[PDB]
Amino acid sequence: MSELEKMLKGEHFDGASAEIEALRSQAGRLKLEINQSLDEAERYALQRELFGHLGHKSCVQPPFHCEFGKTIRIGDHTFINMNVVMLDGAPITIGDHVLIGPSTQFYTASHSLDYRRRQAWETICKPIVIEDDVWIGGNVVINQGVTIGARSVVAANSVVNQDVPPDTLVGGTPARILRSLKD
Amino acid sequence: MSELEKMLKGEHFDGASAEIEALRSQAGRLKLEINQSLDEAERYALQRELFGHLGHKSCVQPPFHCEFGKTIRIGDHTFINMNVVMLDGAPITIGDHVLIGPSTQFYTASHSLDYRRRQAWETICKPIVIEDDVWIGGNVVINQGVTIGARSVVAANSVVNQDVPPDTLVGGTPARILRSLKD
Amino acid sequence: MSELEKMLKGEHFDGASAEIEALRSQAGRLKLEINQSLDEAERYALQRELFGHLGHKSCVQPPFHCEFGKTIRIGDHTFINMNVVMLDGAPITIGDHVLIGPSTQFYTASHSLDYRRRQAWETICKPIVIEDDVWIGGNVVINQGVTIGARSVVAANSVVNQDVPPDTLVGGTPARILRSLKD
Amino acid sequence: MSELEKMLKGEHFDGASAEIEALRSQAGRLKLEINQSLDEAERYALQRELFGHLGHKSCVQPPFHCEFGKTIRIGDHTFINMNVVMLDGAPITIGDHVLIGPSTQFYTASHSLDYRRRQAWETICKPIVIEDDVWIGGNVVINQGVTIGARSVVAANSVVNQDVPPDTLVGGTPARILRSLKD
Amino acid sequence: MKMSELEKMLKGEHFDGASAEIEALRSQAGRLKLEINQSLDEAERYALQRELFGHLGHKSCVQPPFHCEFGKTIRIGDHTFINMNVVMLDGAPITIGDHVLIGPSTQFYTASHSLDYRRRQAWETICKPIVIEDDVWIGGNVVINQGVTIGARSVVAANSVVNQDVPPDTLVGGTPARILRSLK
Amino acid sequence: MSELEKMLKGEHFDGASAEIEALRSQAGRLKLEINQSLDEAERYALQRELFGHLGHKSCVQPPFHCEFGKTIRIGDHTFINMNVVMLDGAPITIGDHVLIGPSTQFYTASHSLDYRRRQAWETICKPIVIEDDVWIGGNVVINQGVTIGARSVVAANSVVNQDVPPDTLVGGTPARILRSLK
Ligand SMILES: CC(=O)SCCNC(=O)CCNC(=O)[C@H](O)C(C)(C)COP(=O)(O)OP(=O)(O)OC[C@H]1O[C@@H](n2cnc3c(N)ncnc32)[C@H](O)[C@@H]1OP(=O)(O)O
Ligand SMILES: CC(=O)SCCNC(=O)CCNC(=O)[C@H](O)C(C)(C)COP(=O)(O)OP(=O)(O)OC[C@H]1O[C@@H](n2cnc3c(N)ncnc32)[C@H](O)[C@@H]1OP(=O)(O)O
Ligand SMILES: CC(=O)SCCNC(=O)CCNC(=O)[C@H](O)C(C)(C)COP(=O)(O)OP(=O)(O)OC[C@H]1O[C@@H](n2cnc3c(N)ncnc32)[C@H](O)[C@@H]1OP(=O)(O)O
Numbered sequence A, B, C, D: 001m002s003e004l005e006k007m008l009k010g011e012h013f014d015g016a017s018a019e020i021e022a023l024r025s026q027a028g029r030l031k032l033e034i035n036q037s038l039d040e041a042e043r044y045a046l047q048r049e050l051f052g053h054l055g056h057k058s059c060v061q062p063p064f065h066c067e068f069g070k071t072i073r074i075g076d077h078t079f080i081n082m083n084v085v086m087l088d089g090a091p092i093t094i095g096d097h098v099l100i101g102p103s104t105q106f107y108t109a110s111h112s113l114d115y116r117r118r119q120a121w122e123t124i125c126k127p128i129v130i131e132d133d134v135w136i137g138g139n140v141v142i143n144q145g146v147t148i149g150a151r152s153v154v155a156a157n158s159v160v161n162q163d164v165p166p167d168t169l170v171g172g173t174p175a176r177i178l179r180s181l182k183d
Numbered sequence E: 001m002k003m004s005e006l007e008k009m010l011k012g013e014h015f016d017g018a019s020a021e022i023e024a025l026r027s028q029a030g031r032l033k034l035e036i037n038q039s040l041d042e043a044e045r046y047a048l049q050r051e052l053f054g055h056l057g058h059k060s061c062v063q064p065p066f067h068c069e070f071g072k073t074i075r076i077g078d079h080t081f082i083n084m085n086v087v088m089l090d091g092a093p094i095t096i097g098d099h100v101l102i103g104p105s106t107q108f109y110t111a112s113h114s115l116d117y118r119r120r121q122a123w124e125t126i127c128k129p130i131v132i133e134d135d136v137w138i139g140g141n142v143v144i145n146q147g148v149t150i151g152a153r154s155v156v157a158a159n160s161v162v163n164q165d166v167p168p169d170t171l172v173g174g175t176p177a178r179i180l181r182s183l184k
Numbered sequence F: 001m002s003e004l005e006k007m008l009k010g011e012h013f014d015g016a017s018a019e020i021e022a023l024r025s026q027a028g029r030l031k032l033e034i035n036q037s038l039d040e041a042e043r044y045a046l047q048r049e050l051f052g053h054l055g056h057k058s059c060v061q062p063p064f065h066c067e068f069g070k071t072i073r074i075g076d077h078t079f080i081n082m083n084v085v086m087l088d089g090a091p092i093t094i095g096d097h098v099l100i101g102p103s104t105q106f107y108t109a110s111h112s113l114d115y116r117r118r119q120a121w122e123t124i125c126k127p128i129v130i131e132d133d134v135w136i137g138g139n140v141v142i143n144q145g146v147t148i149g150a151r152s153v154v155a156a157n158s159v160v161n162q163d164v165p166p167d168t169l170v171g172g173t174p175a176r177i178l179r180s181l182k
């Protein structure tokens, strides 16, 4: 098993592995051009090379930050605001009609509580999934292995450690259910 | 009203309008020039092109992020630190002698909690107001239609959802009164 | 002493002092070079002009933002993620085997709660220390004068106002002890 | 005719026409994005937006300098090297299998020898045509109203003021016929 | 005080180019050229060009990319146009008059070196001024060498090398330039 | 013999070959980074990455354009001015104390005069050697397979098609011997 594939699969891996490093450069180069670009069509085009998928009529405002990019998939009519950071060692999958606030963070990557197990920067990545019609506010942290339920809202500055059921407003750190949005 | 007029006045608006798109383009350019400037006098002069007003002896440290620029009006002797983000569809007014920490966020924009009214990226913008002699901590979120009262202070990482009384210290998410700064 | 010395030592100072201005200017030039660099070897080289110290096999990810650069000393086998903000008017010292996640804030700077004592942008700087094997999550604030004890972990979106003991997990705003990590 | 129509036929046009003006700015935008492009596919795309035409499997090496772009038509399998300047007030047409060396110059524009006929920057433009299978060396000038005959070769540092016949080697300032290439 | 290493250069004496004053001006001009060259706003391009140059006149225009070393030694009159890709080595004054037209890729060399390889090893350099008078048309890809004066209302043929003062009301061409016609 | 190897050594080659495309892409990124840098020590550091070699106390002024970079070796105390273009399919070797002026072009590459043999962009690259203490003026073309003898000088706007003897001043298009400097 490739170190790359180990990373995507939530197992231990070497980050200096070559195919991974290359992915990382591809990503570095693209961020810089996208981020320094004033042509809207030019940014979208380069994002189709940066991202795993970028859907129709979706927008991702610069500056946008990520580590690998190809792991990220964005559906249709989806909008991501400025200054978003995604640690994308594992797949990040984003639905349709999703809104994401500024300075929001997606961290697939994580570490062990035991310092003896972090001395080689050992990391595990688990995927994040944002379902359709979700609204994530600004300055939010969504941690690894979380799924956000459809038609749900995450309040500004929340930290989401666990799944968010659908049709729901949640808030805080860690996030809690504030109200049901179901009819 | 023109679509631009509606956005300013807290009405529903068409984001794709030519007038709104011109200002968005102006802002993007000036933003990029300001964030890449090595020359402090050049940066000031560019920031006087971006913002609607920027007062006497005031400093805004790059990188600064905004959408339109023109609706932002800052007083004299006011310091805004690095990595600030402002969503300025609605006017943002900042008094004299204001201190704003790094990575602070100003969102004049919000969306409906009802997901069916989010599909066309419907947005409502209401102004934000910072009065004289306010100190705002880092990583703070300030939400729409909010007025921060004179000589108050906001704790780091607070999120402000409603007006902050003057001569007051507030903190937390959402912010609550912590102490009286009155004398 | 010189104004630079006063700032370092925790006393009021003159931010526009030619010595302090010059170092701020150095850092701004170096920051734009590093943040815009597509070469890792050059980037690292660059960072060693920017910082007081960068350790062996240590690493800092673009973009990175600080005021002065030369107050910051970073040890070996340490990794700092993207989009970090450091207000470094006073020394910030970071040990070996240290991890810092994206968008974390280190503030050495502070002002007084009395607005009358803030109208000249008066500021005190207190040193921040991070001891070996510490793990700091994403979107965290560490405030002035704080030491984080060896082998401790700070949860995401925490605000740390006072020292953290060794072998501990802390979280919340303000951060509270969550659990001993010892044994 | 439209001012753009005048220009494509090589008729006199108003250079400060709303339409021309817009073309000149579009070209300036694209020149910048093209010249600062680090992505091959996106560079070709931008190039097809600049030029009137850019044929299948052809190449234009950055940096490239031009005025309007849309007046330039390039055939199939034609390579244009680095640092080329084209004054494109009137049409420039390049055929299939053409090779153009670094720093070459194409001037459709010139002025009267009567200095009193130059005080308003009065300029007359005349079309250039490069036929199929031509090799233009480096550092060459091709003046206005010139047709370069098919399968012909123009030596380095040469200046061409009049039509060059097919199957021919020219060289010199002004270029003269060195030898016949037919056999 | 006494003559600066910058004075020496402008005055065609031998100078140390590594001197702090010279480097600062080279640094300033490098910053301004980059900003000028990638600039997308017209009003802004002129403002910066006014920061680059010693003087830039009313209704005058310099098309990016433009290359120069020091900038401040350059002076340009009113109603003057300079096209793209022009390079100026401007260790000494460069003075351009009114109603001047300069083609693309034209080179202005105020700099020079001795033909004795022994006198070139510390990169010894002497700069002598260039002066272009009113109403002159210089073609594209022309080289103009140090200490040259192009008299008023003259024309330099494309890709010409001008080694020597050029008479007013004259058309010149070739390498080195020679008189093609009186235009009087 | 690989495609990179054939290029370097004056045979036809597949320019889309992955080795060649690798080097070109690295050169493209570095050139842009160098040309857009205001930090002289940075450009120089970046340049040690781009070129085969870059000697002590040597200066290469931006903008500088080349195709591959690694085929270029430049010695100590050598100065290359602005906006120089180098087509470097074959090795380009430059000595100590050399001076190159603005907009000079070095073309290691060439083509056939027979159009039938250019229809696939066929290209042959032959090296160029500039010896110690040479002074090359501005707007000069140096064609492939040419050596410039030590302590020689090249007049501005010349095209050099053939080797230039040591201690000589040459000029013209094509370059002719003007005077001995010996
Ligand atoms: C696409 C773009 O970029 S948009 C730009 C960025 N904009 C945003 O981030 C906006 C984020 N929106 C907010 O956070 C809002 O305050 C919303 C969505 C939670 C609105 O809350 P509302 O339901 O309308 O009102 P309300 O203030 O009563 O909230 C209810 C509860 O949420 C709590 N709450 C409100 N805001 C937050 C918050 N940010 N974090 C945690 N809890 C919160 C309140 O304490 C209250 O608690 P309770 O259960 O004890 O009564
Ligand atoms: C503007 C610039 O350029 S500087 C750059 C950025 N720096 C910062 O943002 C610093 C922000 N300043 C603050 O957070 C400060 O801690 C202040 C203004 C609240 C000072 O309060 P102090 O009285 O000096 O400190 P202290 O920690 O003892 O206050 C205690 C109480 O405040 C509350 N508190 C402190 N910090 C926070 C916080 N970030 N959020 C919410 N509550 C907080 C705690 O609840 C605490 O306990 P309590 O509930 O029992 O009262
Ligand atoms: C170097 C880098 O760039 S790579 C990775 C960067 N990513 C990170 O920032 C990830 C952040 N990780 C965290 O914050 C985690 O939530 C941790 C480490 C604090 C705890 O995770 P776990 O122990 O595995 O799970 P768990 O949710 O059960 O934690 C336990 C308790 O901590 C508390 N807690 C968890 N997260 C937080 C938080 N963000 N703020 C405050 N308290 C928290 C919880 O209340 C929980 O409940 P309890 O106190 O009642 O027992």
Ligand SMILES: CC(=O)SCCNC(=O)CCNC(=O)[C@H](O)C(C)(C)COP(=O)(O)OP(=O)(O)OC[C@H]1O[C@@H](n2cnc3c(N)ncnc32)[C@H](O)[C@@H]1OP(=O)(O)O
Binding pocket: D081, D099, D100, D101, D102, D136, D137, D138, D154, D155, D156, D157, D158, D169, D170, D171, D172, D178, F107, F109, F110, F111, F143, F159, F161, F173, F174
């Ligand atoms: C498209 C790209 O990316 S790659 C191309 C980059 N490189 C080039 O531009 C190289 C330029 N090409 C050349 O110069 C051609 O080979 C030519 C025109 C010199 C022809 O070379 P050949 O004639 O085969 O060689 P040769 O030197 O023996 O013949 C030269 C004859 O023309 C003359 N001559 C040679 N070069 C030139 C020139 N550049 N200008 C004018 N005359 C020339 C010589 O005087 C001689 O003429 P003469 O005998 O009548 O007096």
Ligand SMILES: CC(=O)SCCNC(=O)CCNC(=O)[C@H](O)C(C)(C)COP(=O)(O)OP(=O)(O)OC[C@H]1O[C@@H](n2cnc3c(N)ncnc32)[C@H](O)[C@@H]1OP(=O)(O)O
Binding pocket: D087, D107, D109, D110, D111, D113, D143, D159, D161, D173, D174, E083, E101, E102, E103, E104, E138, E139, E140, E155, E157, E158, E159, E160, E172, E173, E174, E180
């Ligand atoms: C300002 C802008 O940006 S415009 C863009 C750039 N455009 C240009 O550079 C245009 C340049 N124009 C020229 O080079 C022309 O050759 C001009 C100016 C000399 C005009 O020539 P004209 O007077 O119209 O006609 P003509 O060609 O007959 O000129 C006659 C003499 O010039 C000579 N000549 C023409 N071009 C050159 C040249 N490049 N070098 C040397 N001599 C030349 C002819 O040999 C002829 O000589 P002769 O009669 O003594 O034997």
Ligand SMILES: CC(=O)SCCNC(=O)CCNC(=O)[C@H](O)C(C)(C)COP(=O)(O)OP(=O)(O)OC[C@H]1O[C@@H](n2cnc3c(N)ncnc32)[C@H](O)[C@@H]1OP(=O)(O)O
Binding pocket: E109, E111, E112, E113, E145, E161, E163, E175, E176, F079, F081, F099, F100, F101, F102, F136, F137, F138, F153, F154, F155, F156, F157, F158, F169, F170, F171, F172, F178
């Ligand atoms: C490192 C850097 O940045 S380089 C700085 C930039 N400076 C330059 O590029 C300067 C270029 N130098 C030249 O052009 C010079 O004019 C040189 C090399 C020809 C030297 O000329 P000098 O010997 O000093 O004097 P002079 O001008 O009288 O030259 C005499 C011969 O040169 C010829 N000549 C002058 N310039 C040239 C030229 N550009 N091409 C061909 N021949 C020339 C004359 O025709 C004359 O020939 P003749 O006597 O056979 O009729």
Ligand SMILES: [Cl-]
Binding pocket: A057, A077, B119, B120, B121
């Ligand atoms: Cl939409």
Ligand SMILES: [Cl-]
Binding pocket: D160, D161, D162, D163, D164, D170, D175, D176, D177
């Ligand atoms: Cl001809």
Ligand SMILES: [Cl-]
Binding pocket: E015, E016, E017, E018, E122, E123, E124
């Ligand atoms: Cl020197």
Ligand SMILES: [Mg+2]
Binding pocket: D157, D158, D159, D172, D173, E159, F173
């Ligand atoms: Mg010629």
